[PDB]
Amino acid sequence: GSSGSSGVKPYGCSECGKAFRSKSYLIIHMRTHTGEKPSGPSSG
Ligand SMILES: [Zn+2]
């Protein structure tokens, strides 16, 4: 038995699959998806 945290947030982008404690953070990020070059560091 060891530390077992769930860690959840009201926001979780689907395109890449990230999260942002705050909404603003998400939007600012979406920019990448919306605009060209949506998939960057998201390799696998
Ligand atoms: Zn994303």
Q: Could you state, in order of their start, the residue ranges of all structural domains in the chain?
A: 1-44
Largest CA distance in the chain: 45
18 CB contacts (<8 Å, ≥6 apart)? 12, 29
Distance of CA 3 from the midpoint of ligand 1 (Å)? 28
Distance of CA 1 from the midpoint of ligand 1 (Å)? 33
Half-sphere exposure of 8 (CA within 13 A, CB side): 2
Angle formed at CA 21 by CA 2 and CA 15, multiple of 5 degrees:
95
Distance of CA 39 from the midpoint of ligand 1 (Å)? 8
Distance of CA 2 from the midpoint of ligand 1 (Å)? 30
Q: Determination technique for this PDB entry?
A: NMR
What does DSSP assign to residue 29? H
